Amino acid sequence: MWGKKDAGTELTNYQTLATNTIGMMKGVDGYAFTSGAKMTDTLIQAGAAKGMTVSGDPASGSATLWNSWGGQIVVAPDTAGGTGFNNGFTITTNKVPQSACVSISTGMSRSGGTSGIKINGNNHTDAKVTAEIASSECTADNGRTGTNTLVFNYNG
Q1: Domain ranges in the chain?
Q2: What fold is seen in the domain 7-156?
Q3: Where is the secretion signal located (predicted)?
Q4: Among 24, 58, 128, 145, which residue has the fewest nearby CB atoms (within 10 Å)?
């Protein structure tokens, strides 16, 4: 059971991939290249993050997940400046409407602790998003506000 919030579903999902991919199918073999595409394909196809089909990047740089209920997702690794086997994974997600811009922020506010939060045309990392912030940052109410592009980064 989860309930409580209908937006927390994604918050727990993203953290699900982070804890699953932590040691599920992030290259449990040791091959050439980074393969930041088949990495998620194998994790998702493993039923970890999501048990659906993935689109292996035709340009080889960042895989993309097709969200039916949501919108679009872009899974890309971001491993730069490590010390104790710390990997930084960056998953952009574009679907969270204004109603969720608040619920998602309320849930992201419980563990603010920045790492690589990049809001729509707001490429940042120390971006501190909260309930009271999402109450102001998002306009009063514009029904279906412009696409709320939010990148989640997970270190370790």
Answers
A1: 7-156
A2: TcpA-like pilin (3.30.1690)
A3: none
A4: 58
